[PDB]
Nucleic acid binder design. Structure first.
Lengths: 108, 90, 82, 98, 18, 92, 101, 84, 98
DNA sequence: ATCGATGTATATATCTGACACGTGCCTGGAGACTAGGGAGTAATCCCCTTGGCGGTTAAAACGCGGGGGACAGCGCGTACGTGCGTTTAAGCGGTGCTAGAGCTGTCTACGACCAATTGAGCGGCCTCGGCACCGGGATTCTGAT
DNA sequence: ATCAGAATCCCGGTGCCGAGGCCGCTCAATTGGTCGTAGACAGCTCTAGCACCGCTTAAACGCACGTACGCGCTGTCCCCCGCGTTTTAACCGCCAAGGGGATTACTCCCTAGTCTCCAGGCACGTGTCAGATATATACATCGAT
């Protein structure tokens, strides 16, 4: 008596589950009432941010001739690009080596 | 539950041939759960300061403009506004 | 005989920590000093994490409780949260 | 006889990513400081918890040393002194250094 | 695409003019 | 209308000091200090009850939140001051 | 007359309404606002006692916010609790490094 | 009055000198003033923008004191005395 | 002849508690920074808001100078240099220095 | 500026266990419909901001001299990196035990929800005194001697 | 040591306005009672942390050495700080216009809620290939000459 259940992530053109973040906003107790179009915005911005760090991680993994993203590559991707870095300034990546710096002291 | 399937989907969309280690999948899996936490925690008290009880899309837009710095704001605020209209479109 | 546990943090270990940070030459007084610092940083985290276990009924320290203590103190750790 | 071996030591260690303090003495230290707050009773520790704690202490110590080295180069000398580590904690704040 | 372009300014952090 | 904490700060000042008075700007300082400390304690209790799948802010949660927030001996008296209030409150 | 029952000064009723309306959690237990008003009363009484001593040292019967800054930053515990706050119209603590002689 | 001074140069040299004298500083170099007027500006550039966004989220046009103290509390510097 | 008048100047200013930068030029500066983000429209300011912003800016600058002067004494000199202020901002952190 | 051996890069094979994909099952997401109230919107008021003028007045600006402070150089000494030989405890692996996490089932005491009642707290109004300011005098340092 | 000259401290006097007390109003706290359900509790089970043992070996420790580097001293040079004079413009006081914050009322669309259905996403299994690793070779190179 109904149509095929097109999920709401499909009708918005995204990959992140809008139903899941809708349930997380409701049960999270952030506010008493959650709007309709608000979790779609949340899923689109999470999709854009994860696509950004995965793109930088892939570019940082290609030049090391490795075809599999390990956490060292995510540290290089995060620390190299400053706009992301300020957002993640507080976080520490587990098993992430410090970006190579010699502090400009060497023999001529 | 986790977010592991969707990180794999976005990775196959951006790079066709690359793969992600299990520990790096756990990194991205905690990262999503942190950024969503900070954005929704901002939008909660933004709704609370103005005596409103609903989180509308204006609140997520102003919370992402409060949190994401620089050009990462100006792209993502597009990506929401590009998305939500399409959601109303269908 | 058994030494104090804090003195198990060797001069090779503290030196290998400092070489990662870019330090070229280390004084001899560092080896006593940062053994105190690593103590105090470990005192602050565990005193939260034990509290996070005491409030729950569980009597052992889960990995989630340490990452919760680090996010409470502000240096949030990734990897084991989810 | 190998001169300036510190440069090869630094360039090897910054590339590497494994943990630098040994696992078992760190576990003995964490279990020793654990018993002071449990009013005498003993606790167990999950195997992932000691790894997460050692990663946290590792990252904080390497950041404290790379911040103190900035002050050493600011003071015109090269050798790291403990007054610079104390000053770097006294300048990072009350809940950033302590 | 016109995605954000990461320059490498002399300042480590963004103080003025990105 | 308008809610504040001005009368209670004034009452506890008259309780602890017999005759000293408080300027209205310092009344606003204490009126914001209480509104900040309460928000930090209730935020800690909310995420702490949420970690353990509990929907109730019970007195255990305020006890663990005040032990997690107030540093040193400020905790050790306040957790003494709280429970002495609750045990009297169940005396009714 | 809830406050009288617990022998406090801060009203537990207004913090009960603030706990429910604040939307921290779905339910509020009965002991929580009693414990909350007790700990707020103790913290306020301790900082106002130190401010009263600081105002008595300058022989003034009126607490100005400069006294609140002095009573906060002389105490070694409240300085930890209120580390990142700034008191409006509050002067810096009188310190000096290089001795003249 | 006759001529207009630079708007950015709203902080005079004795004013910055008086700030550093309140900071317990003995002696000031001459090159501080071309840079501390920089480091003040970026501070306001961080704070004021956040406050405007708060006023932007409501329909209101004027920035109140509550939106500045909210813009400072979110950044980390709680300001007591006006909020409330 | 009055030597070391900085001692009485500092002892006067640390005792005092009023705001130091003049009100009207600070209001013109904040109204200058306001107009660049409102894409042409002007905003009004409540009279308490500009006082709140001036209080916060003065407190942040006196913290920055008290952090920089410890580094100035750390380098063995007495006069504050802009490399010290840039180093104190480089070392305070990402949200503590900016 | 050449030669050696020490390190660095690269090229090969080899093996392994972690990844990716496939299957199967199910609980959470979607579809449809309702009922009610939160919020959007329009109308109105009056507070609070803006703006401009005159008139003072501290404070800023400018210039000058001198001293004291930064900085470069050098010599002395010492403390830390390096190398070598010796020794220890970290680490693998493997085996056994059980305490305790974790799940499930029950039942009740607790807390939301609602209607009626009233006084504690808020707004305004006042009045007076604590504090700011000032002027004279008393003491106590402080640079000049 | 010796000094007057500032400088500080105190002290009686005025004054004013902001704190504190009082009054009246009203809406939010309290009381009583019912409903349902989250959580306390108890029981049961199966993982995972703990303990131990034994063998390996890479890592730690100690001790001698040498030489690079902290640090104290000096000398020159310069750039702030104090001080006097001039000049600006912030500040106070005033009024006048109006923009927009804030309030109230009306209506309706949106969202919580329930029921009912099924597939996207979970766990589990299993084959395979990326990557670690060992070994050989080619090449840069830094120290001695």
């Amino acid at each position: 008596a109904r149509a095929k259940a097109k999920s709401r992530s499909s009708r918005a053109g995204l990959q992140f589950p809008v139903g899941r973040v809708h349930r997380l906003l409701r049960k999270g107790n952030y506010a008493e009432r959650v709007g309709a179009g608000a979790p779609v915005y949340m899923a689109a911005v999470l999709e854009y941010l994860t696509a950004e760090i995965l793109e930088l991680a892939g570019n940082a993994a290609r030049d090391n001739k490795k075809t599999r993203i390990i956490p060292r590559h995510l540290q290089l991707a995060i620390r190299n690009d400053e706009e992301l870095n300020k957002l993640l300034g507080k976080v520490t990546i587990a098993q992430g080596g410090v970006l190579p710096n010699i502090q400009a002291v060497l023999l001529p | 539950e986790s977010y592991s399937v969707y990180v794999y989907k976005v990775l196959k969309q951006v790079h066709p041939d690359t793969g992600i280690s299990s520990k790096a999948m756990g990194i991205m899996n905690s990262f999503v759960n942190d950024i969503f936490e900070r954005i929704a925690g901002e939008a909660s008290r933004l709704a609370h300061y103005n005596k409103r009880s609903t989180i509308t899309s204006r609140e997520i837009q102003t919370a992402v403009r409060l949190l994401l710095p620089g050009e990462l704001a100006k792209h993502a605020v597009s990506e929401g506004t590009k998305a939500v209209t399409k959601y109303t479109s269908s | 005989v058994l030494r104090d546990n804090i003195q198990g943090i060797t001069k090779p270990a503290i030196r290998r920590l400092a070489r990662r940070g870019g330090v070229k030459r280390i004084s001899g007084l560092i080896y006593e000093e940062t053994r105190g610092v690593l103590k105090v940083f470990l005192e602050n985290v565990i005193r939260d994490a034990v509290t996070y276990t005491e409030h729950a009924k569980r009597k052992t320290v889960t990995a989630m409780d340490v990452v919760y203590a680090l996010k409470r103190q502000g240096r949030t750790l990734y990897g084991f949260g989810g | 006889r190998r001169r300036q071996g510190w440069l090869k030591e630094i360039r090897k260690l910054q590339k590497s990513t494994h943990l630098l303090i040994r696992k078992l003495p760190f576990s003995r230290l964490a279990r020793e400081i654990c018993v002071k707050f449990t009013r005498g009773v003993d606790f167990n520790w999950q195997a992932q918890a000691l790894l997460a704690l050692q990663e946290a202490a590792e990252a904080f110590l390497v950041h404290l040393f790379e911040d103190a080295y900035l002050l050493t180069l600011h003071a015109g000398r090269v050798t790291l002194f403990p007054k610079d580590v104390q000053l770097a904690r006294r300048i990072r704040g009350l809940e950033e250094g302590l | 695409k016109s995605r954000r372009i990461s320059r490498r300014p002399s300042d480590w952090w963004v103080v003025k003019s990105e």
